Coordinates of C-alpha atoms (C1' of nucleotides) and ligand atoms in Angstrom, one line a residue:
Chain A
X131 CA 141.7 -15.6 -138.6
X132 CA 140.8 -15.9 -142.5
X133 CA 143.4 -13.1 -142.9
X134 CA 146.8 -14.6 -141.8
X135 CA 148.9 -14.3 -144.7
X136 CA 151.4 -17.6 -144.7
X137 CA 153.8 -16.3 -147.5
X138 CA 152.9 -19.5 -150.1
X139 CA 151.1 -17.3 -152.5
X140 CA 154.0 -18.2 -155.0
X141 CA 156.1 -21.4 -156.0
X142 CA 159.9 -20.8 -156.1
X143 CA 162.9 -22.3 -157.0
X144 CA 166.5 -22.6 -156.7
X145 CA 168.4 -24.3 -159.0
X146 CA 172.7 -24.7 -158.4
X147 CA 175.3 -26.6 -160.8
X148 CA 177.2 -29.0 -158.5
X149 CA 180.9 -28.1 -158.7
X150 CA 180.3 -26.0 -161.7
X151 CA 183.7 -25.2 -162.9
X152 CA 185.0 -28.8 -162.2
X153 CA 182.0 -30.3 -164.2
X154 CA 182.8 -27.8 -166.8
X155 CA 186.6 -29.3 -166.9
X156 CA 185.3 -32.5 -166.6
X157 CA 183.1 -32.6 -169.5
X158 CA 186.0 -31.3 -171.6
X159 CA 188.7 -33.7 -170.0
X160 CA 186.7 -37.2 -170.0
X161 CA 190.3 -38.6 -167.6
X162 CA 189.1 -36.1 -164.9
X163 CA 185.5 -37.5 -164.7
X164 CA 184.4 -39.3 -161.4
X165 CA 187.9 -38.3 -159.8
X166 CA 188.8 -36.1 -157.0
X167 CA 190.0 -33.0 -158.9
X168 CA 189.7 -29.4 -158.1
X169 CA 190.1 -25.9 -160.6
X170 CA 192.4 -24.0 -159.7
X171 CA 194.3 -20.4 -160.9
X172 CA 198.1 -19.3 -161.3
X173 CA 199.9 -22.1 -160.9
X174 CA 203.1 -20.6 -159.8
X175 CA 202.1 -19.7 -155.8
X176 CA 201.9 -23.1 -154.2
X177 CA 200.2 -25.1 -156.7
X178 CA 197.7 -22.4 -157.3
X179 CA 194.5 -21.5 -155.5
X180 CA 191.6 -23.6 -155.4
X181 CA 188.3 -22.2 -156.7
X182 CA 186.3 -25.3 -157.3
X183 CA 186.2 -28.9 -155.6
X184 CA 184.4 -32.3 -157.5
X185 CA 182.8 -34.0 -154.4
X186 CA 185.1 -37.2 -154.5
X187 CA 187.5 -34.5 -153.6
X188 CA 185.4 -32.7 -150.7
X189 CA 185.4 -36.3 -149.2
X190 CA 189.1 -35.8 -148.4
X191 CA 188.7 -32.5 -147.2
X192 CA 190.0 -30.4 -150.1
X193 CA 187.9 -26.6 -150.1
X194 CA 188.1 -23.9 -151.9
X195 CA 190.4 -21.2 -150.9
X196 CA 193.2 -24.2 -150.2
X197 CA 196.6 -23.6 -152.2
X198 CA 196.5 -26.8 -154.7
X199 CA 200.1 -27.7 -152.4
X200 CA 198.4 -28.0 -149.3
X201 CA 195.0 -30.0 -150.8
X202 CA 197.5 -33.1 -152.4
X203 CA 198.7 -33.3 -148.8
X204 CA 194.7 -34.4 -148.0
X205 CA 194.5 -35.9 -151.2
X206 CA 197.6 -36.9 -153.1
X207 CA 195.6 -38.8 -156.1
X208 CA 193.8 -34.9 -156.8
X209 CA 193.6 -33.8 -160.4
X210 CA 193.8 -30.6 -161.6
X211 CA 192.2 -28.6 -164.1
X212 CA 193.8 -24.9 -164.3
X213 CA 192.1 -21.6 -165.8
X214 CA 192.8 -20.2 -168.9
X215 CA 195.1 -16.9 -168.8
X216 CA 195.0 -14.4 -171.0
X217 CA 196.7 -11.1 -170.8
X218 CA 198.7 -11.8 -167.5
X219 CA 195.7 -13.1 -165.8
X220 CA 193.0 -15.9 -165.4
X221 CA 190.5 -15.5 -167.9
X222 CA 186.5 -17.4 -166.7
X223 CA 185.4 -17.1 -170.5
X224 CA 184.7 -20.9 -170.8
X225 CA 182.7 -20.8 -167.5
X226 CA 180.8 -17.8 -168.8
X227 CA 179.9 -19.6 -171.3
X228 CA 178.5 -23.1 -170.0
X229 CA 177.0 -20.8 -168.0
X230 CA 175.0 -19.5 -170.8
X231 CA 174.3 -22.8 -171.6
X232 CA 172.6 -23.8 -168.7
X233 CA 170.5 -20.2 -168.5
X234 CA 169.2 -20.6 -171.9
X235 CA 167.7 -24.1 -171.1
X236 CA 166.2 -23.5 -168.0
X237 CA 164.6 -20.0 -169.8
X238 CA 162.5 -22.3 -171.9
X239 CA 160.7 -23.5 -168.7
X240 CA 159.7 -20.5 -166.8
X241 CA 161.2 -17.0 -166.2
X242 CA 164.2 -17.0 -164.4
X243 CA 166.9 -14.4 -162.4
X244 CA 170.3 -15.2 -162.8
X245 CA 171.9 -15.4 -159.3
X246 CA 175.2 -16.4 -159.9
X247 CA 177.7 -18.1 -162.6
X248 CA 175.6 -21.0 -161.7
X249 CA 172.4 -20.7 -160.4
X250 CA 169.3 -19.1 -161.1
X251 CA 165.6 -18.4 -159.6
X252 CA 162.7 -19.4 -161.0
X253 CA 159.3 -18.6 -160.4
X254 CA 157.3 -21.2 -161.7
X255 CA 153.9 -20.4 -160.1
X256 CA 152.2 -19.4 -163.2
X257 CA 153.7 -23.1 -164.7
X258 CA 152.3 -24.5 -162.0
X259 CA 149.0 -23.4 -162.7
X260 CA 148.9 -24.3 -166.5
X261 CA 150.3 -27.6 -165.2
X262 CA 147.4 -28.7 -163.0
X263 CA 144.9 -27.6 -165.7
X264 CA 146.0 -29.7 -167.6
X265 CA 146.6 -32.7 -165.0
X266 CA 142.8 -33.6 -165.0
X267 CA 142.8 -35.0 -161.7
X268 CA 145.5 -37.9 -161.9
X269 CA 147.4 -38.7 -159.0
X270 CA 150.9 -37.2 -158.7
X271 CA 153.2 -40.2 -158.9
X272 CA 156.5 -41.4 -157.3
X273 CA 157.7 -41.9 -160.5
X274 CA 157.5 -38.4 -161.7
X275 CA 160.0 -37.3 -158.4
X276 CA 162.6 -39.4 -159.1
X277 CA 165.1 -37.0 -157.5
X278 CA 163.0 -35.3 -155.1
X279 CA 163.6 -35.1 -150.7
X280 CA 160.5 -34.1 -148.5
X281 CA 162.2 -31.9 -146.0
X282 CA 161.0 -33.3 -142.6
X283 CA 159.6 -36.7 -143.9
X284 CA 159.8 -39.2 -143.5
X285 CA 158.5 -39.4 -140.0
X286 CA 156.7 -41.7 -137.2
X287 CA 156.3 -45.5 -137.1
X288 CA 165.6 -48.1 -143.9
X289 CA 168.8 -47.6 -143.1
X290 CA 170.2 -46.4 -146.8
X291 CA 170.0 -43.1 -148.3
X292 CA 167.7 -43.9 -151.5
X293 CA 165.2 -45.8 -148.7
X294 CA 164.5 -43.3 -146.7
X295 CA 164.4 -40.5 -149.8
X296 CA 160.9 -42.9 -151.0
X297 CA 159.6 -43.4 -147.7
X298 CA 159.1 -39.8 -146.8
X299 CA 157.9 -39.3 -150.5
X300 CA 155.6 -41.9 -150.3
X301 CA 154.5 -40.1 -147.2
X302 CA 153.9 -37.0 -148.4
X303 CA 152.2 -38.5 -151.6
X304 CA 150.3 -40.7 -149.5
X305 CA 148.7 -37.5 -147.8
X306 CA 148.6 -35.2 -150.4
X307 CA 145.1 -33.5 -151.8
X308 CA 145.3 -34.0 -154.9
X309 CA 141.6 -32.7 -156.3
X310 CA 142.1 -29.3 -154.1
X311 CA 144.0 -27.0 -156.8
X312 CA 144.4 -24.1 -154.1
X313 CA 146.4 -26.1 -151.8
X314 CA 150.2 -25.0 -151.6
X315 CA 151.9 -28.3 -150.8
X316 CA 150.1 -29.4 -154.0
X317 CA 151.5 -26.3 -155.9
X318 CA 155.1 -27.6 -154.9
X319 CA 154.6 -30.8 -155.3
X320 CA 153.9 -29.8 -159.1
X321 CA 156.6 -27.5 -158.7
X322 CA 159.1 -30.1 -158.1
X323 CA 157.4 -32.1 -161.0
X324 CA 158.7 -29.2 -163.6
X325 CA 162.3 -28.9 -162.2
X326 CA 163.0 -32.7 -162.7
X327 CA 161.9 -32.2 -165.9
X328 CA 164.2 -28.6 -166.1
X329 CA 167.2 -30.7 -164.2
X330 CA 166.6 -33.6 -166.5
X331 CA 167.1 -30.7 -169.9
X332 CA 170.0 -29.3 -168.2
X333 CA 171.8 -33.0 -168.1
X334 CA 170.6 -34.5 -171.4
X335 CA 171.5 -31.0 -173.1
X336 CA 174.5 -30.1 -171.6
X337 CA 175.7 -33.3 -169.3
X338 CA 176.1 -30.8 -166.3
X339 CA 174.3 -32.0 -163.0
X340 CA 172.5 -29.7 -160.9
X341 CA 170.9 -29.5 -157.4
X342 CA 167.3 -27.3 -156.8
X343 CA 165.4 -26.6 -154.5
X344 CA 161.5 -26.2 -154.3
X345 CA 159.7 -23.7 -151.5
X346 CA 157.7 -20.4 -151.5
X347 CA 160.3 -18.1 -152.0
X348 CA 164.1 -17.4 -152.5
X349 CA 165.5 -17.8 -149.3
X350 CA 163.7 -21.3 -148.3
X351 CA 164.7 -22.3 -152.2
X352 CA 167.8 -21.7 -151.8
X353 CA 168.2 -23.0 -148.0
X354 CA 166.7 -26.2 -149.3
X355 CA 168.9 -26.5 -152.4
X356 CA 171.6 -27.3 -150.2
X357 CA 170.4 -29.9 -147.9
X358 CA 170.7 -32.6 -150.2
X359 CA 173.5 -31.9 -152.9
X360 CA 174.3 -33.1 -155.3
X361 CA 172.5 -34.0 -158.0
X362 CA 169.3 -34.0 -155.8
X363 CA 165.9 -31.6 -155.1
X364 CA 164.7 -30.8 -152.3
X365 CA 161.0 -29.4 -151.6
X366 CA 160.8 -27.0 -148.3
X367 CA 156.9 -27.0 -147.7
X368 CA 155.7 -24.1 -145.4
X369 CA 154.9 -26.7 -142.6
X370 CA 158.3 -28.5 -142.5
X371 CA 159.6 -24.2 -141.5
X372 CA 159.5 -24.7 -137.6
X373 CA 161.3 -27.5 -137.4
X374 CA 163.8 -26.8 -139.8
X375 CA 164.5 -23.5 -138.4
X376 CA 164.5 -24.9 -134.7
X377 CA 168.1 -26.2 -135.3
X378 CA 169.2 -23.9 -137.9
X379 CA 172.1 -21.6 -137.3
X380 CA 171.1 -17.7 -138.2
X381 CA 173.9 -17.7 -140.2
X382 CA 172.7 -20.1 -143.2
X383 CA 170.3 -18.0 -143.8
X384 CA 171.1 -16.0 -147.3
X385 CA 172.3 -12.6 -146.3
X386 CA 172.6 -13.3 -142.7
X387 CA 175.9 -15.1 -143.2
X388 CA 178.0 -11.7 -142.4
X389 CA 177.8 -9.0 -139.6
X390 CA 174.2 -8.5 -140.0
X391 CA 173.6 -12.4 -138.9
X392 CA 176.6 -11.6 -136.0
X393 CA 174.5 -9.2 -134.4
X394 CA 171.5 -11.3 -134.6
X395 CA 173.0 -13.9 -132.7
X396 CA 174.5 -11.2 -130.2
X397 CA 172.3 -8.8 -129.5
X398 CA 169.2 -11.0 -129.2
X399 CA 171.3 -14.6 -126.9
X400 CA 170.5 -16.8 -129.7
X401 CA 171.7 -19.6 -132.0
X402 CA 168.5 -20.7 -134.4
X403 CA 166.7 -18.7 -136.7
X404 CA 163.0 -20.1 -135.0
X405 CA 164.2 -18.6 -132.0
X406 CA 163.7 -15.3 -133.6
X407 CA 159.9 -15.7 -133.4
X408 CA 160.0 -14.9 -129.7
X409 CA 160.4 -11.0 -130.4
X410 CA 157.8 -8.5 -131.4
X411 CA 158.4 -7.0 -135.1
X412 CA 158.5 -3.8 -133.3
X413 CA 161.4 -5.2 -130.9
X414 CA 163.7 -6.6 -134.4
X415 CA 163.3 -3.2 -135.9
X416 CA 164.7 -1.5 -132.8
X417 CA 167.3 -3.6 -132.5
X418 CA 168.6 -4.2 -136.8
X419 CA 166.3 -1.3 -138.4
X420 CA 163.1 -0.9 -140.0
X421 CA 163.4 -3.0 -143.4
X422 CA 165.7 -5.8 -141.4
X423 CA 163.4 -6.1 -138.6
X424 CA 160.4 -6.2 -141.0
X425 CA 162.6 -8.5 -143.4
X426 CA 163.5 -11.0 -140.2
X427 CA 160.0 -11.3 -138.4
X428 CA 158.5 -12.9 -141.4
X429 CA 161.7 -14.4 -142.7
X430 CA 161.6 -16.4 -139.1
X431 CA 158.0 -18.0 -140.5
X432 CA 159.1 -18.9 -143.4
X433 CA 157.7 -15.6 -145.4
X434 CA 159.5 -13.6 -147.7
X435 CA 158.3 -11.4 -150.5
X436 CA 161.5 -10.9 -152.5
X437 CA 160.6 -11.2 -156.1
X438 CA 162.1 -13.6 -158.6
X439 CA 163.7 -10.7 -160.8
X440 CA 163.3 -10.8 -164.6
X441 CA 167.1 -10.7 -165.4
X442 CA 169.2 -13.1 -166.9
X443 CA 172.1 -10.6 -167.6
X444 CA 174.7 -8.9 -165.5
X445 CA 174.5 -5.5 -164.9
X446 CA 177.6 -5.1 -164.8
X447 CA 180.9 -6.1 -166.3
X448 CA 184.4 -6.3 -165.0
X449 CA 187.4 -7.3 -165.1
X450 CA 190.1 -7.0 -161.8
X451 CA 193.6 -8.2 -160.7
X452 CA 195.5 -8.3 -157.6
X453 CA 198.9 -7.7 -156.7
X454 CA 199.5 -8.6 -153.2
X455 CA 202.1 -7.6 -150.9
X456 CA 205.6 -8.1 -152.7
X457 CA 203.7 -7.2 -156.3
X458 CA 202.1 -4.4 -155.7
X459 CA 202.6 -2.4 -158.4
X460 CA 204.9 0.4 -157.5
X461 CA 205.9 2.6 -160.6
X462 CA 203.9 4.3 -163.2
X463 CA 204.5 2.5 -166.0
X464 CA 203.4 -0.6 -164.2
X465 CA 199.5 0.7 -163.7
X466 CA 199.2 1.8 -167.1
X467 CA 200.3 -1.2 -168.5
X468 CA 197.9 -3.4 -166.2
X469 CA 194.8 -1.4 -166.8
X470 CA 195.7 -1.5 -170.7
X471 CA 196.1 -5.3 -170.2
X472 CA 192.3 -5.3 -167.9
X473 CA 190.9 -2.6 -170.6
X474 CA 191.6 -5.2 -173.3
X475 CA 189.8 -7.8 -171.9
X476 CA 187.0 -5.8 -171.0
X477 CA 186.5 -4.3 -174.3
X478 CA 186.2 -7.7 -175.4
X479 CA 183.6 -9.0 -173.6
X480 CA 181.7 -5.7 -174.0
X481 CA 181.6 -6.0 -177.8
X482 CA 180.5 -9.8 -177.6
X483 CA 177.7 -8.3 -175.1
X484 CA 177.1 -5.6 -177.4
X485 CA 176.4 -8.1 -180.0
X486 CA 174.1 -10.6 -178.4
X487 CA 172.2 -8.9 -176.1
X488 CA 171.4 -5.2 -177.8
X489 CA 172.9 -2.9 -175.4
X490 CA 175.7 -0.7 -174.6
X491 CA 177.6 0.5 -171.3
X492 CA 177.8 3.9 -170.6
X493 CA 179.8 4.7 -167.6
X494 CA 183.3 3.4 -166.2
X495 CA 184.2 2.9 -163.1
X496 CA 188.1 2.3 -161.6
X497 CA 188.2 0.9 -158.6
X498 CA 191.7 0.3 -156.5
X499 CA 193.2 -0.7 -153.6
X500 CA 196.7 0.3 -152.3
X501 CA 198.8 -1.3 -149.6
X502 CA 198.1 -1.6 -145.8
X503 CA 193.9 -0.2 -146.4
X504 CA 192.0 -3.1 -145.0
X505 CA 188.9 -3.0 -147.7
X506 CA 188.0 -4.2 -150.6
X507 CA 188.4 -1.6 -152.8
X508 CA 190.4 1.8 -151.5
X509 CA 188.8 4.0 -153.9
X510 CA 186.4 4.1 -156.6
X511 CA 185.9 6.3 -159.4
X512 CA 183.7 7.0 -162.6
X513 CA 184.3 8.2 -166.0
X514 CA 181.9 8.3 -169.3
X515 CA 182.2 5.0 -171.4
X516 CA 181.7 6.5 -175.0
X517 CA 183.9 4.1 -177.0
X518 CA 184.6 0.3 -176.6
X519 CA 188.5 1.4 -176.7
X520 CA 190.7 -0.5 -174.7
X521 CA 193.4 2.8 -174.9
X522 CA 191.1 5.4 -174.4
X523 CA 189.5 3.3 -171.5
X524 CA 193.1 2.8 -170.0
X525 CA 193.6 6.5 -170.6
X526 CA 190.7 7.2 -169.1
X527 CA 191.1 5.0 -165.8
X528 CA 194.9 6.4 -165.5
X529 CA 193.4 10.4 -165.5
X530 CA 190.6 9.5 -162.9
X531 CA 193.5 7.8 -160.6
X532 CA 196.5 9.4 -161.5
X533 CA 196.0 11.8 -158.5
X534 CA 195.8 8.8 -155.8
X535 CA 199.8 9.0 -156.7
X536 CA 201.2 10.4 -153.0
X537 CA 204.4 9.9 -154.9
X538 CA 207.0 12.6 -154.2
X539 CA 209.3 11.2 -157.5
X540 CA 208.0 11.3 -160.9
X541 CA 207.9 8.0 -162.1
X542 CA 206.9 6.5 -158.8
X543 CA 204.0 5.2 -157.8
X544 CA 203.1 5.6 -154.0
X545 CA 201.3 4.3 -151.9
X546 CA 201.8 1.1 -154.1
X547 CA 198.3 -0.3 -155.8
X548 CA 197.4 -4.1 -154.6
X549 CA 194.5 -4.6 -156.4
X550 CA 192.9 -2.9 -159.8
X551 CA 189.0 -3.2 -161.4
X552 CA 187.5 -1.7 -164.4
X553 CA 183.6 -1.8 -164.0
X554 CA 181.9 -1.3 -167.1
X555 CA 177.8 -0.4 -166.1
X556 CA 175.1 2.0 -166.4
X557 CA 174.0 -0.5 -169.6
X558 CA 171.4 1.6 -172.7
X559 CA 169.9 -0.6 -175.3
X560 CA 171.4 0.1 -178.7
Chain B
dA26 C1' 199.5 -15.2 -150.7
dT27 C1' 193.1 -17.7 -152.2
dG28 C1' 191.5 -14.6 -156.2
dA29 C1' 187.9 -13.0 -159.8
dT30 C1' 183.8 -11.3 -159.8
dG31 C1' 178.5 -9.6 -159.3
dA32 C1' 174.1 -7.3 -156.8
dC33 C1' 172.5 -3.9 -154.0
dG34 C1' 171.9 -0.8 -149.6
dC35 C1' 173.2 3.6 -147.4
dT36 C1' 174.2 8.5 -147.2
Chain C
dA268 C1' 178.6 10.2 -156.3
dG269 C1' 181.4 7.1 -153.5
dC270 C1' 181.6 3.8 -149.9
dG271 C1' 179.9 -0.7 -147.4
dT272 C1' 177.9 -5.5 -147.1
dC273 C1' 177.0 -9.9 -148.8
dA274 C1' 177.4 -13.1 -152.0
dT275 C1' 179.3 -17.3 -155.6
Ligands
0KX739 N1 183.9 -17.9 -153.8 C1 183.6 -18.5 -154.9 C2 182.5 -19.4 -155.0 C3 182.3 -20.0 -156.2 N2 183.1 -19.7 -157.4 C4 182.9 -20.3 -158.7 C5 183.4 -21.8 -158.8 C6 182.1 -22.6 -158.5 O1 182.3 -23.7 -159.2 C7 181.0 -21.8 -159.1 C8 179.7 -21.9 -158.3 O2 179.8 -21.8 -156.9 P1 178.9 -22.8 -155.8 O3 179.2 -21.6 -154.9 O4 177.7 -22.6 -156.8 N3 180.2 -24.1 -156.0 P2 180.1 -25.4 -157.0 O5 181.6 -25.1 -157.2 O6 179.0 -24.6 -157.8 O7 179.8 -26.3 -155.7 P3 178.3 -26.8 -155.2 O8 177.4 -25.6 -155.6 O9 178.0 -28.2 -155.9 O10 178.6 -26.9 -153.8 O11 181.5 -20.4 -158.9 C9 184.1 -18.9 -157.2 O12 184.9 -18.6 -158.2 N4 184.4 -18.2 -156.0
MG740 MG1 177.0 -24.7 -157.4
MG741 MG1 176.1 -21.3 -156.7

DNA sequence: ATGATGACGCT
DNA sequence: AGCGTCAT
């Protein structure tokens, strides 16, 4: 009735840097620019491992995770850009850093969560409102979405990309209510008025290019960031849900994409996340639990009620290595020197964070991995954080792990350690 | 033999 | 506290 709650009580968005690390090597290296390249770390093993892929690049078929060897056999013209190291390993200091570009510019507009290296939410529903204040009544033009897709439009009775984008914009211009300030397809539309402008600050202020999306909340803004990379927005209204979800795999869905989404698809026979609106709540909380069977009966609507968190810093800090198979590290010496060699990189970056941003860890946590365990991390372990000392840190880590040592001989170190992390959390302001 | 990270749920 | 999942 008047009481069916349709989850567009809030205007959300998404907003992603197209192959951030490549454009961040690209704006550096002007010779890389329009050019299938890819970043990549450690150049020894095979070329080195690909982390990020321009889209000229993608065209050919390069991903991520590809040794940089095995990509030039897609692509033999690929350029490479390769990370810093410092302190026997790669070293993202330049990409936390344009990073910080980009956060700080799209933090004038509205407040935002940092998702990732290179994205962040925004909720821009109270920007919204100020916005259509002070839009008397004036028609929302074509001109002001010069970058903007209307999910599902255009529809009923041109064969190139940027002809269809302006037909199903005109469409949903054409239609839209433009002197009914409640309406939520007008709240988007105005939405995806501010993040052309907020795309349109990150280029002229930074030269990266960025994709968004526009929709009620986090999930649908960030399903709909991706449909039309890059260098494109995309607004997900609530009525273009059921026929987007009709063909959309379960596993697209943001947090679906592991064993949680597996189970979905085969305990319940499906394939498509609308298909989930067959079953009761009740049923989806027998079968995945009580907050994932809430979470997915509205999720299949197109309702979610995840806020858009006021954080733009991490957490957490860390710093980790690995040392696969004919590496691992094997003797005693070996560990102490690595984690004096990851303690001295995170004490850096702690006293820069220290510095800007008023605050001060005060726990650490040693995290490993030996060989043959199948898991991320083995085996983790906390200690107080009292003095932004890479030796007493090392120290520190080497006491809380020293008795992981199975090792029979005294300088030995068995089972033998693939993979070490220092965490530095449990932030106080200061 | 991608790796280097970061957020958060569960018990 | 320590472990597990999901993510870029
Ligand atoms: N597994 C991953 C995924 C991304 N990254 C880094 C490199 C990416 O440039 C950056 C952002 O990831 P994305 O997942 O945002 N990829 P980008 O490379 O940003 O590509 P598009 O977002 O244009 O597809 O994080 C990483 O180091 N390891
Ligand atoms: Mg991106
Ligand atoms: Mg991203």
């Amino acid at each position: 009735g008047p009481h069916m709650a349709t989850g567009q009580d809030r205007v959300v968005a998404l907003v992603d840097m197209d192959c951030f690390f490549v454009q961040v090597e690209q704006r550096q290296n002007p010779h890389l620019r329009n050019k299938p390249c890819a970043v990549v770390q450690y150049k020894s093993w095979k070329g080195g491992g690909i982390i990020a892929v321009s889209y000229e690049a993608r065209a050919f078929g390069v991903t991520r995770s590809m040794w940089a060897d095995d990509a030039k056999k897609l692509c033999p013209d690929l350029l490479l850009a390769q990370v810093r190291e410092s302190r026997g390993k790669a070293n993202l200091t330049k990409y936390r850093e344009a990073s910080v570009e980009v956060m700080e510019i799209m933090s004038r507009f509205a407040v935002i969560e940092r998702a990732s290296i290179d994205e962040a939410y925004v909720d821009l529903t109270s920007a919204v409102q100020e916005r259509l204040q002070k839009l008397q009544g004036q028609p929302i033009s074509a001109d002001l979405l010069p970058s903007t897709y209307i999910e599902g439009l255009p529809q009923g009775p041109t064969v190139q990309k940027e002809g269809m984008r302006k037909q199903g914009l005109f469409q949903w211009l054409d239609s839209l209510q433009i002197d009914n300030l409640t309406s939520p397809d007008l709240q988007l539309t105005v939405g995806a008025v501010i993040v052309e402008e907020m795309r349109a600050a990150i280029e002229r202020e930074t030269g990266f290019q960025c994709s968004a999306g526009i929709s009620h909340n986090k999930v649908l803004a960030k399903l709909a960031c991706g449909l039309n990379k890059p260098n494109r927005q995309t607004l997900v209204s609530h009525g273009s849900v059921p026929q987007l979800f009709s063909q959309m795999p379960i596993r697209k869905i943001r947090s679906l994409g592991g064993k949680l989404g597996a189970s979905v698809i085969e305990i319940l026979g499906i394939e498509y996340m609308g298909e989930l609106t067959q079953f009761t709540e009740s049923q989806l909380q027998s079968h995945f639990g009580e907050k994932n069977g809430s979470w997915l009966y509205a999720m299949c609507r197109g309702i979610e009620h995840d806020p858009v968190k006021p954080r733009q810093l991490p957490k957490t800090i860390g710093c980790s290595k690995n040392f696969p198979g004919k590496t691992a590290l094997a003797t005693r010496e070996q560990v102490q020197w690595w984690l004096l060699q990851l303690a001295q990189e995170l004490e850096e970056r702690l006293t820069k964070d220290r510095n800007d941003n008023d605050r001060v860890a005060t726990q650490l946590v040693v995290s490993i991995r030996v060989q043959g365990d199948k898991r991320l991390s083995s085996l983790r372990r906390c200690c107080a954080l009292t003095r932004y000392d890479a030796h007493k840190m090392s120290h520190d880590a080497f006491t809380v792990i020293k008795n992981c040592n199975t090792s029979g001989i005294q300088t030995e170190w068995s089972p033998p350690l693939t993979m070490l992390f220092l965490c530095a959390t449990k932030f106080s302001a200061s």
